[PDB]
Amino acid sequence: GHMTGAHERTFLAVKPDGVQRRLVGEIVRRFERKGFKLVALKLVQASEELLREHYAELRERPFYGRLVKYMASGPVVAMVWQGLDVVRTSRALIGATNPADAPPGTIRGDFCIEVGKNLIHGSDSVESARREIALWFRADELLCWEDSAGHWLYE
Amino acid sequence: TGAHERTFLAVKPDGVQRRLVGEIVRRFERKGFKLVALKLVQASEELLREHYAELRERPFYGRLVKYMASGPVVAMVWQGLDVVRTSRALIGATNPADAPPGTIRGDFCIEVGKNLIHGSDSVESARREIALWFRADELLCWEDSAGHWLYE
Amino acid sequence: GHMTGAHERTFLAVKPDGVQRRLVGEIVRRFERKGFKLVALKLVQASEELLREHYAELRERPFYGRLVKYMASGPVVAMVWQGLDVVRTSRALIGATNPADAPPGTIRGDFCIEVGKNLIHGSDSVESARREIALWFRADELLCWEDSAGHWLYE
Amino acid sequence: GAHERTFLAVKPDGVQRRLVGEIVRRFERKGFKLVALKLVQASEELLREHYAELRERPFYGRLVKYMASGPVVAMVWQGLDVVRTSRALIGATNPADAPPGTIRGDFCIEVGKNLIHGSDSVESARREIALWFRADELLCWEDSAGHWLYE
Amino acid sequence: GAHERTFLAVKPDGVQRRLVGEIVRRFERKGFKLVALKLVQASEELLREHYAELRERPFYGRLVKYMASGPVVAMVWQGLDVVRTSRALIGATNPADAPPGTIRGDFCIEVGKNLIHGSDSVESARREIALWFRADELLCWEDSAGHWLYE
Amino acid sequence: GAHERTFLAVKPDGVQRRLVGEIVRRFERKGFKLVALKLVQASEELLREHYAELRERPFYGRLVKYMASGPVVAMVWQGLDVVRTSRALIGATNPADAPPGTIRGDFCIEVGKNLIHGSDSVESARREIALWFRADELLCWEDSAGHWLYE
Numbered sequence: 039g040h041m042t043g044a045h046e047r048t049f050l051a052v053k054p055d056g057v058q059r060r061l062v063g064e065i066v067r068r069f070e071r072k073g074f075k076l077v078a079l080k081l082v083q084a085s086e087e088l089l090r091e092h093y094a095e096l097r098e099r100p101f102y103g104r105l106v107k108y109m110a111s112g113p114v115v116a117m118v119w120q121g122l123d124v125v126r127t128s129r130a131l132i133g134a135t136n137p138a139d140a141p142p143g144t145i146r147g148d149f150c151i152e153v154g155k156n157l158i159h160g161s162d163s164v165e166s167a168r169r170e171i172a173l174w175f176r177a178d179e180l181l182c183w184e185d186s187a188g189h190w191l192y193e
Numbered sequence: 194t195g196a197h198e199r200t201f202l203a204v205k206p207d208g209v210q211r212r213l214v215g216e217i218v219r220r221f222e223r224k225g226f227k228l229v230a231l232k233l234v235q236a237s238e239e240l241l242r243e244h245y246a247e248l249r250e251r252p253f254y255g256r257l258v259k260y261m262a263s264g265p266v267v268a269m270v271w272q273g274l275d276v277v278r279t280s281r282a283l284i285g286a287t288n289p290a291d292a293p294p295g296t297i298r299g300d301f302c303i304e305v306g307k308n309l310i311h312g313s314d315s316v317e318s319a320r321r322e323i324a325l326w327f328r329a330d331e332l333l334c335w336e337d338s339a340g341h342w343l344y345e
Numbered sequence: 346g347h348m349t350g351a352h353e354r355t356f357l358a359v360k361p362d363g364v365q366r367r368l369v370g371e372i373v374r375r376f377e378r379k380g381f382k383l384v385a386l387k388l389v390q391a392s393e394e395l396l397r398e399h400y401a402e403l404r405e406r407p408f409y410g411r412l413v414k415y416m417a418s419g420p421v422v423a424m425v426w427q428g429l430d431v432v433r434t435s436r437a438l439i440g441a442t443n444p445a446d447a448p449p450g451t452i453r454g455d456f457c458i459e460v461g462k463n464l465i466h467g468s469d470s471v472e473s474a475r476r477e478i479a480l481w482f483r484a485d486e487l488l489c490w491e492d493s494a495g496h497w498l499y500e
Numbered sequence: 501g502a503h504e505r506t507f508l509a510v511k512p513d514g515v516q517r518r519l520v521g522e523i524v525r526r527f528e529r530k531g532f533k534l535v536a537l538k539l540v541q542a543s544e545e546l547l548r549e550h551y552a553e554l555r556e557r558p559f560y561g562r563l564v565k566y567m568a569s570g571p572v573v574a575m576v577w578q579g580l581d582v583v584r585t586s587r588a589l590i591g592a593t594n595p596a597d598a599p600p601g602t603i604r605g606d607f608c609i610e611v612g613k614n615l616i617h618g619s620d621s622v623e624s625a626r627r628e629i630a631l632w633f634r635a636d637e638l639l640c641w642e643d644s645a646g647h648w649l650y651e
Numbered sequence: 652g653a654h655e656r657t658f659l660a661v662k663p664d665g666v667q668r669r670l671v672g673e674i675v676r677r678f679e680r681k682g683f684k685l686v687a688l689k690l691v692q693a694s695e696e697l698l699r700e701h702y703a704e705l706r707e708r709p710f711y712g713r714l715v716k717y718m719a720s721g722p723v724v725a726m727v728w729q730g731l732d733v734v735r736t737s738r739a740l741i742g743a744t745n746p747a748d749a750p751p752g753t754i755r756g757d758f759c760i761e762v763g764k765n766l767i768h769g770s771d772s773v774e775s776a777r778r779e780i781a782l783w784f785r786a787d788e789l790l791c792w793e794d795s796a797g798h799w800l801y802e
Numbered sequence: 803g804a805h806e807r808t809f810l811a812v813k814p815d816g817v818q819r820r821l822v823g824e825i826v827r828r829f830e831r832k833g834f835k836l837v838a839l840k841l842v843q844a845s846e847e848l849l850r851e852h853y854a855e856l857r858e859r860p861f862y863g864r865l866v867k868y869m870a871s872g873p874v875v876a877m878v879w880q881g882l883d884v885v886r887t888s889r890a891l892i893g894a895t896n897p898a899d900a901p902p903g904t905i906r907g908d909f910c911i912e913v914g915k916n917l918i919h920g921s922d923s924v925e926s927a928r929r930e931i932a933l934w935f936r937a938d939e940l941l942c943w944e945d946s947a948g949h950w951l952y953e
């Protein structure tokens with residue numbers, strides 16, 4: 039928002055490769071240790087229809103069909119994290135979309151190799167986040183809770 | 194059900210607040226269990242009364258229910274051979290005082306009322322708890338590429 | 346005390362081997378993650394006199410002299426931790442005095458090999474803790490602070 | 501230059517969030533030698549002196565009040581280029597600009613809750629070390645790893 | 652007794668699950684000294700000899716076939732009571748009986764996929780070391796940590 | 803491109819500081835496939851040839867002597883763009899320039915004690931792999947993770 043910005047939210051999804059390679063906890067832990075507030079979480083198998091909409095911007099790219107099929111092929115961990123500048127900061131935490139360009143210390147820099155098996159998706163902007171959160175979650179899945187760590191993360 | 198056995202695990206509000214969700218999940222992942230359901234919820238007192246019905250005559254029942262309803266919980270289902278009993282071993286004794294180092298409660302907790310997690314105590318309790326907390330369409334079946342390296 | 350027991354304190358010292366082998370942080374982290382409250386901490390070089398008094402109970406053992414000399418030979422990290430049953434629980438976290446008998450998951454079980462190079466000392470009882478705390482720390486080195494994590498560790 | 505020293509302080513947020521060990525471990529694993537350490541509650545007067553250069557900034561008063569409000573872990577680390585390298589390990593003062601892999605990049609969000617203070621220069625380090633520690637708190641020890649860290 | 656040695660092998664499941672580094676790190680952090688190491692594919696002939704004591708057990712044939720089926724990381728570690736202590740670090744042969752904190756307790760489920768083999772005695776270690784390594788693969792090096800690990 | 807290979811060696815400082823497991827774990831967690839591994843002490847003759855491109859540099863002689871002075875862990879890792887990516891994981895040759903999150907950024911201080919050597923190109927890797935390993939030490943194995951790492 040514009041109050042303090044602290045209620046900004048982003049959508050993050052661990053892709054099937056992240057689940058298969060047993061990196062869910064590792065990924066969650068990095069967001070937790072950063073100070074962000076987990077406000078929604080579910081393991082789902084996403085429909086192709088949802089994924090087509092999710093990735094509509096990429097519909098003209100040659101990998102689009104396989105991306106959609108692959109993301110529909112197995113479990114995904116869908117999440118919403120909340121905090122100041124969470125959208126941009128989460129993109130920084132995960133690293134460049136192509137792991138080859140993601141420095142060590144980022145999730146993709148540390149844990150994967152190839153752009154099509156890049157572990158995670160994070161919203162690229164506040165507007166994309168609003169759209170992605172709405173697409174993947176119902177409103178009643180976004181939890182309001184009193185974060186005891188807020189005091190130590192925010193001035 | 195052998196390798197398809199399932200257990201219910203919930204990270205309690207203290208585990209969420211202390212930022213130990215990832216740590217807990219990681220321990221189950223590294224053990225080789227298969228995550229088949231997961232959600233962040235705020236459970237109603239009604240659900241929790243039913244969850245803990247066996248304990249209704251204990252003096253801590255009311256506060257346990259209120260506490261578990263007071264904040265977010267991470268509900269989970271894990272699948273694998275002897276996962277119910279093995280999960281109990283990984284988490285440690287219900288009372289952290291009796292949970293050795295290396296277990297979740299042994300490493301992270303002090304008091305029985307702030308003991309981070311609940312895990313099903315038996316296959317029958319797991320069936321009941323899974324049904325109570327999850328709909329069938331929240332339980333995912335997936336083909337585990339690691340299964341070959343964990344099982345015969 | 347007897348109120349709730351939550352203000353019990355224990356004395357822990359990282360020995361020179363723990364400093365040399367770069368395990369100070371690892372050891373502190375294990376007490377932090379357990380939920381105990383750090384109420385004193387200092388790096389010191391302990392005098393032989395203090396150590397003779399500290400280990401008076403062992404004065405008849407053949408290794409007493411070398412123990413005293415060794416503990417005086419390098420930096421020690423002196424600590425006081427506070428919490429319910431902290432004395433006994435800390436002993437469990439550190440493991441048996443002899444690392445050969447300390448199971449994996451304990452500090453000595455994970456990190457050292459021989460009884461004379463066993464990384465750490467923890468008070469063996471509430472009375473020894475009272476004595477050790479008094480010996481190593483002045484009262485004004487024991488800090489009273491409001492522990493925000495207390496709410497999540499104590500019912 | 502192996503005997504250079506820097507002053508580092510874990511702020512109350514780092515103590516509260518149980519990150520003292522994590523922070524120390526990062527300095528240990530880098531190869532630096534811990535030569536002083538204490539848990540203290542610093543007076544406002546000490547902190548006013550510590551942060552004197554910032555006295556005209558709008559956040560000065562609250563910075564001082566906050567730093568005095570809870571326990572801090574004061575430390576001195578020793579090694580080649582420790583001042584500048586510690587700054588690199590901690591990351592930008594403002595966590596917004598600190599990349600993942602740094603302490604603030606991994607653990608913090610806001611400049612006012614940024615876990616730690618490290619000396620910004622050798623001159624500031626000398627001043628800060630002297631302010632927080634007495635000479636007899638600074639230990640000399642022979643580092644068995646030194647052979648494997650320094651050519 | 653500080654020069655005792657044991658043989659450890661990471662089994663194909665440990666390599667496939669990418670736990671080699673994790674396993675090595677546990678022995679390193681304990682203080683033991685790595686004196687030999689190689690990635691190999693063992694022949695069934697070698698493995699039959701390795702596990703000759705088990706030749707009458709019903710799982711012998713499949714154990715041999717499985718251990719020959721893919722790469723193994725063979726190792727020798729040195730230190731006081733390394734044989735017995737390594738067995739404790741790895742945990743009970745059946746992971747069902749291996750407590751959390753042990754390698755098998757933390758990482759495995761089933762006795763047939765139990766990540767690692769460690770010598771059961773000093774004599775078996777001598778025999779296993781000889782079987783898997785040539786003499787010139789066992790390295791003598793001066794351990795800078797030795798002074799901080801041993802009396 | 804997925805079958806590209808690089809040569810990595812943990813230098814004596816990495817072995818002495820007990821960071822072998824840590825280093826291996828970083829390559830494993832990235833997704834690369836370990837296809838050769840051994841603990842060795844290299845001769846000066848081998849090392850002279852290994853570092854021949856640096857023969858005119860003032861540190862060449864000391865580098866050769868140092869690398870011959872104790873055990874090294876030689877490795878080959880396989881995967882897409884593994885040469886360039888391994889260089890990124892290890893960080894700048896000089897640790898002063900290597901950011902936190904890299905191996906040298908997290909663990910080292912000085913260029914001469916920089917823990918590890920990684921091939922600087924595909925061609926140098928081919929040459930280094932050939933120099934340090936016999937062909938029969940490079941293992942081909944079926945990687946269960948391949949499906950989750952590659953398209």
Ligand SMILES: Nc1ncnc2c1ncn2[C@@H]1O[C@@H]2COP(=O)(O)O[C@H]2[C@H]1O
Nearest residue numbers: 096101105135153154155156158159160
């Ligand atoms: N050039 C590419 N070839 C194949 N897949 C790609 C390419 N670029 C992007 N992708 C994938 O397309 C995905 C779309 O956005 P994600 O954040 O999910 O991460 C992206 C990659 O996983």
Ligand SMILES: Nc1ncnc2c1ncn2[C@@H]1O[C@@H]2COP(=O)(O)O[C@H]2[C@H]1O
Nearest residue numbers: 245253257287305306307308310311312
């Ligand atoms: N004596 C007790 N006092 C308070 N809470 C208790 C006591 N015994 C059990 N509990 C709590 O009751 C919970 C019921 O099952 P859980 O697995 O949630 O873990 C248990 C503890 O957190």
Ligand SMILES: Nc1ncnc2c1ncn2[C@@H]1O[C@@H]2COP(=O)(O)O[C@H]2[C@H]1O
Nearest residue numbers: 403408412442460461462463465466467
């Ligand atoms: N049998 C022994 N031989 C040598 N040192 C010992 C022996 N038993 C105990 N010690 C050491 O004496 C120390 C006294 O108590 P600590 O907890 O400091 O840890 C003990 C060991 O480090």
Ligand SMILES: Nc1ncnc2c1ncn2[C@@H]1O[C@@H]2COP(=O)(O)O[C@H]2[C@H]1O
Nearest residue numbers: 551559563593611612613614616617618
């Ligand atoms: N704009 C600001 N608002 C609040 N605090 C600030 C601001 N800029 C700097 N600081 C704080 O001032 C502190 C002084 O130096 P430190 O290294 O402690 O880290 C600095 C920050 O924590």
Ligand SMILES: Nc1ncnc2c1ncn2[C@@H]1O[C@@H]2COP(=O)(O)O[C@H]2[C@H]1O
Nearest residue numbers: 705710714744762763764765767768769
């Ligand atoms: N009942 C069993 N079924 C299958 N494998 C077994 C059984 N009991 C023991 N083993 C395996 O046999 C191996 C022999 O020694 P290891 O140390 O390699 O570890 C043992 C187990 O992996």
Ligand SMILES: Nc1ncnc2c1ncn2[C@@H]1O[C@@H]2COP(=O)(O)O[C@H]2[C@H]1O
Nearest residue numbers: 856861865895913914915916918919920
């Ligand atoms: N100026 C230097 N002084 C000393 N060693 C150097 C210098 N520059 C490069 N090196 C070392 O020489 C090595 C050559 O390649 P390495 O990858 O082994 O890593 C390099 C460094 O360890």
